[PDB]
Structure formats: structure tokens, C-alpha cells
């Protein structure tokens, strides 16, 4: 089980509402983390589409409409992007990332 | 550990077409490359929908997981989905037996293309 | 506005030695990390390494470390990843990107560079019929770049639009791919149909016999 688990495909109709899921292994506490979202469609480069730690920290990517949005399950260590208005340039590849901000230590290699 | 990693990600399909079986097609190996001592099995497979699908070859029954190389469902122009899938052997193995199969799998259906010498 | 541009596609040979670049335009380039993602054919995204031009404060993942080197020029505020030796494995495509105030989100990704190394030599196509005996194709094999283009043609100088082309494949070092015609039972009228096909390292026509 790695540290971040996405279902591999879904599947929804136009018009439509969907939620991709990553999950954070539980080894860690996803109410420390942010969830970031990127979009790739077939054949060109990543896009940042969002960032989401709650509903007063957040941040929408360069001209990421508003139908997509972020929100976390903290209780299920999840983090979510819904997109609604499913229209066929949603069509793509999406991959979730997650920084905790908080990251340190390392002074094992200066005493 | 987290920080710097990408899941593994999450390939979402928008449905805006009526389902369709693929037609499916099967090609043996051909001459100038059958004289040159060496095998190739063509498959191709267009004008599906949901552009969603599986092959798994099979060899008089049992199946071949030995140079078994497949592209992506393409999306064509008039917006159904394509695909190719080829399987490398030796004009001794491709007469030896006597079956080859194309079994294609899409949305429960499965679809089977055979061809022998 | 705010853009990362890389340089252009590569093709080499494994040993070979390489360097890409990644510029970036309207912004303070000095002032935000600069990383490096790569993507083999196929797969998903992989985190190489970061740096900060501001002062070139460099830092690589566990699987890169010794085996790429990031750089940055400040006055052309541009970037670099580079290999010593190049390796089959490292045929894959090359993004660059900026971090963000969330420092760990790639805001502005460049648009990409691609490298492939192979074994072999860049090298025109060869051509082939398909049939059995239903429709019939003819195929392209042992070529680099990825750079072809089908075309089709009666036994008579004809057009033909009843084709489609399908995706290249990546084996032994060189690419393949197909191209069918479909046509009316009711012939045998005929014999062969003609097969063209175009290369930068040079374009063949051939026939191609239907049952
Ligand atoms: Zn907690
Ligand atoms: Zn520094």
C-alpha cells in the first residue's frame, strides 16, 4: 500500500458531478497535509488545477474554473476534487500530490 | 513519504456517447517478413465507445504473455476510440500450433478474432 | 505572461553525454524553486529534483541522486538537467516547473522535452502488407524518430480516405506502427493497392494485395 492510493479509472456522464479520491496511507494524518491536484490531459503537460487544507486555505490554479473544487475527509484521511459540469475536455489523467508545510530534521549530516 | 510524490493517478473517462462494441481484426504475419525468419500478429481495433478496453491473446486456448506490445485507445476523428496490439514470435512457432486469438474485452463483451496458415 | 519554455525533442545513443534547458519568463525568476518531473511513456509523474536560482541551492530524489545534474544560469534566468551517460531507461519525456507559495505544488509547468535513446541508428522505414484470407493494412517497422506519416493508393493513381492511422510502439529500439483499408467484397477487378508512406530519414511507397 503505497503513501498515496488513487483508483486508476472512472467513468461519468456530461453535465455530471463527479469525486476523484486520493487516499493518504494512514501512516500519517492528512489534517496536517494540503491536497494538490493536477490535470493532464492526453498527450500535453500537467496542469495545477488546485490546492485545498480547508475551506479558509485554499488556492484555485492560473484559470482553474470554480466548478472545480477541493474538500478533505480528515476522518478518512482523503482528499477530494469534485468537479461539476462534467464536459468532455475534463476528459484526462489526474494526480494528486500532498505537502504538509512542516517538513524539517536532516541535521544528520552536520553534528 | 509523502512531500514530492504523485499518486499514481486517476484516468477519468466522460461519457458523451451511446456504448459500442469494437469491430475487431485480426492480420497474420506477412511475406518478406515470414522469409525472413520472423513473426509478427497484428490486431487492431476501432470505432469503439467507451474508449475502455482489455486484450488478452491465447495461443490455441492458453493465453501468451511473451512480446505481447499494445498502444492506447486513441480517439479518432469521428470520436470513437481505436487501438493496436502486436505479438512477436518465429515463423516456427507461427506454423507449429494452428490457433491465435485476439480475445478483446470491453464493457463485459468479449470478442475473439482467430487465424491460422 | 508567466511561462517555463524547454528546449527542444532529442534523439540519441546510449553513452552519449546531455544537456536541456528550461527558461522562464515574467516573473522573479530568482525567486522561486525550479524543478525537474520526468515522464517515461506510459506512466505517471516522478519528482527528479529542485533547485533555487537565487542562490543554485540544489537538491535531487533518491532514485536521481548521481544520476542527473540540475543547474541554473540566473542572468538568462534559465535552468538545466544534464546526463553524463545516457541509458535506454532514460528515454522519457522531461518537465520542468515552478514551485508556488505552497511550495510544494508545481504552479507553471514548460511544456516538455522529450529524449529517446536507442540502441540503434535513426533510420528510414520498412513497409509490409497485411492480409489473411475482412479488411487489409500495411505496417511500418524499424525507424527513428517517431516521425511518420501513412498514405494510401489504388492500383491506379488514386486517393484513398477509407484509412485511419494507429499509435506508434517503442521495441528493440526502433517504432512500428499501422494503417488499414477497408473496401467493398465485391471485387474478384484487381490485385495490389499502393502503400505510402513519409520519414525524415527518408519515405517509400509499396503495393499492397487484397484477396
Ligand atoms: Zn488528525
Ligand atoms: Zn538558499
Known amino acids: 500500500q503505497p503513501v498515496l492510493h488513487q483508483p486508476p479509472a472512472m467513468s461519468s456522464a456530461l453535465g455530471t458531478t463527479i469525486r476523484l479520491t486520493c487516499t493518504l496511507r494512514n501512516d500519517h494524518d492528512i489534517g496536517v497535509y494540503s491536497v494538490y491536484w493536477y490535470q493532464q490531459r492526453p498527450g500535453h503537460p500537467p496542469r495545477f488545477l488546485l490546492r485545498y487544507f480547508s475551506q479558509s486555505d485554499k488556492s484555485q490554479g492560473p484559470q482553474v474554473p470554480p466548478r472545480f473544487s477541493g474538500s478533505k475527509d480528515v476522518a478518512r484521511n482523503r482528499g477530494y476534487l469534485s468537479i461539476s459540469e462534467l464536459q468532455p475536455e475534463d476528459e484526462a489523467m489526474y494526480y494528486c500530490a500532498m505537502g504538509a508545510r512542516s517538513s524539517e530534521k536532516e541535521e544528520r549530516e552536520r553534528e | 513519504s509523502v512531500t514530492h510524490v504523485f499518486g499514481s493517478g486517476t484516468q477519468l473517462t466522460v461519457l458523451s456517447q451511446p456504448k459500442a462494441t469494437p469491430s475487431v481484426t485480426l492480420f497474420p504475419p506477412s511475406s518478406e517478413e515470414l522469409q525472413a525468419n520472423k513473426a509478427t500478429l497484428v490486431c487492431l481495433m476501432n470505432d469503439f465507445y467507451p474508449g475502455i478496453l482489455t486484450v488478452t491473446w491465447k495461443a490455441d486456448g492458453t493465453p501468451i504473455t511473451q512480446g505481447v506490445e499494445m498502444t492506447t485507445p486513441s480517439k479518432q476523428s469521428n470520436n470513437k476510440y481505436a487501438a493496436s496490439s502486436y505479438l512477436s514470435l518465429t515463423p516456427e512457432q507461427w506454423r507449429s500450433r494452428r490457433s491465435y486469438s485476439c480475445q478483446v474485452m470491453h464493457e463485459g463483451s468479449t470478442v475473439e478474432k482467430t487465424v491460422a496458415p | 505572461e508567466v511561462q517555463l519554455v524547454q528546449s527542444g525533442a532529442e534523439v540519441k545513443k546510449p553513452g552519449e553525454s546531455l544537456k536541456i534547458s528550461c527558461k522562464g519568463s515574467?516573473?522573479?525568476?530568482?525567486?522561486?524553486?525550479i524543478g525537474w518531473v520526468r515522464q517515461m511513456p506510459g506512466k505517471g509523474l516522478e519528482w527528479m529534483g529542485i533547485?533555487?536560482?537565487?542562490?543554485?541551492?540544489?537538491r535531487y530524489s533518491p532514485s536521481f541522486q548521481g544520476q542527473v545534474t540540475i543547474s541554473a544560469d540566473k542572468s538568462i534566468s534559465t535552468a538545466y538537467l544534464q546526463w553524463s551517460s545516457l541509458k535506454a531507461s532514460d528515454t522519457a519525456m522531461y518537465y520542468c516547473?515552478?514551485?508556488?507559495?505552497?511550495?510544494?505544488?508545481?504552479?507553471?509547468w514548460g511544456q516538455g522535452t522529450t529524449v529517446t535513446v536507442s540502441s540503434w541508428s535513426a533510420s528510414a522505414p520498412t513497409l509490409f502488407p497485411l492480409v489473411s484470407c475482412v479488411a487489409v493494412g500495411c505496417l511500418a517497422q524499424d525507424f527513428l524518430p517517431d516521425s511518420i506519416t501513412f498514405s494510401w493508393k489504388y492500383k491506379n493513381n488514386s486517393d484513398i480516405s477509407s484509412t485511419r492511422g494507429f499509435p506508434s510502439v517503442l521495441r528493440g529500439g526502433k517504432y512500428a506502427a499501422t494503417s488499414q483499408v477497408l473496401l467493398p467484397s465485391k471485387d474478384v477487378t484487381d490485385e495490389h493497392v499502393v502503400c505510402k508512406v513519409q520519414h525524415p530519414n527518408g519515405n517509400k511507397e509499396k503495393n499492397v494485395p487484397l484477396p
Open positions: 516547473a515552478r514551485h508556488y507559495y505552497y511550495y510544494y505544488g508545481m504552479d507553471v
Open positions: 515574467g516573473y522573479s525568476f530568482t525567486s522561486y524553486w
Open positions: 533547485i533555487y536560482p537565487g542562490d543554485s541551492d540544489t
